[PDB]
Amino acid sequence: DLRLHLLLNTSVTCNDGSPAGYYLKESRGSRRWLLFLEGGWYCFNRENCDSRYDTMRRLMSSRDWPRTRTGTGILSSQPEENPYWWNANMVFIPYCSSDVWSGASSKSEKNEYAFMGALIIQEVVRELLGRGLSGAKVLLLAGSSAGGTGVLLNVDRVAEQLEKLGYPAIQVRGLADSGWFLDNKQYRHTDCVDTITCAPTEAIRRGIRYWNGVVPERCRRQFQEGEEWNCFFGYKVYPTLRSPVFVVQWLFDEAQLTVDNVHLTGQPVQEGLRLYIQNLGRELRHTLKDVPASFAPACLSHEIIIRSHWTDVQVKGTSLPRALHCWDRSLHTPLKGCPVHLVDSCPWPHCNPSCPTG
C-alpha cells in the first residue's frame, strides 16, 4: 500500500551515497501523519560498517529497495490491525544511515560513508509538505529500536523545522518504541568488538564521534563537549525535550540484554543472573516513573508498534492502541478511565500474561 519515493534532493544520501527515500500512502480525508523511523542497530567504525555493507546493505543503500511496502501494525490502514490511527497518512522512512538517525555529515574524499540520518528526516519532512503535510494537524514521529532512539533525537528538531518554515499549527509528537536504553554495566564483560556485543555506553561513545552525530539542544548544553553520547539514552534526553513523547519499552528488551551480554536460552538461570535481570527491570521501571505517557510491559521481546499483533499486549488491562488514544485526548489532568501511564511492576520476564509468545 506504501509507495517508494526517493528523495528529490539527491545529496541527502544513504551510507553508500545512494539517495535516501520514504514510502508513502496518502489518506486525503485525514489531517494526521505518521512518519515511522525504521530501526536496525548501527555501525560505529569503518571496518565494521564494511561488514554491515556485505550482509545488511539494505540498511546502507537504496539500490535494491522495493518500489512498494506493506504497512503493518501502527502503519496499517485496517481497523482490525490498527485500531488507533488506521485512517492516517502513513510514512515509512527506511533506515539507511547506520547512525541512530543522528548524522548530519556528507561523504567526501576523507570519509568512506555518509551519515545523514538527521538530514534524511528533515528532508523527508521538507518534501512531504508539498504532498499534504502542510495541511496536517498532528505529525507523529514514530520509530522502533534505533528508530525509537531516533525519535528522541529528532522530535524537537522536526518541531523547530516546521516552526521556522512557517507551520506553527502542526502539532509534532513523538512515539519512541524500544529505543529507551540504559547505560548500565554488562552482566559479563566484553571488549567493544562487533555491534551486538559491545556495551551500550561504549557503542554510542564510538558512534557519535564516527557519525558526527547531533543531539537535542538543551541536552547538549547539559553534558557539553565530549559528553553528547549521554543524549542517546532516553532517561537522560527525555527530560530536555519539549515535544510530547510517548515511550514504549519492554522492561526486558532483547537488544538491551544483548548489549549487556545476557543470553536467556538455556534452562539454568543462576542466582547471579536472576539478580541482574531483576535489577535491570527495576532500573528501567525507575527511569519511567516520571514519564507520564508510557507503555512498559514486563516482557522479554524486541519492538512492538509495527508488528501485526501489537494490539494483543496489555498493561493493567489497557492495550497500547487504547493508551495511545488516551494520549491523544490528553493533548486535545488525568482522564476518566483512559490511562496513559502503564508500567508493569512484576519483576520477571513474562510475569505479564499478555507478553508475546513468539
Ligand SMILES: *[C@@H]1O[C@H](CO)[C@@H](O)[C@H](O)[C@H]1NC(C)=O
Ligand atoms: C540538499 O540537501 C543538502 C544536505 O543538507 C543541502 O546542503 C542542500 O542545500 C539541499 N539542496 C536543496 C536544493 O535543498
Ligand SMILES: O=C(O)[C@@H]1CCN(c2ccccc2)C1
Ligand atoms: O536495537 C537497536 O537498534 C540498537 C540496540 C542498541 N541500541 C542503542 C543502545 C544505546 C543507545 C541507543 C541505542 C539500538
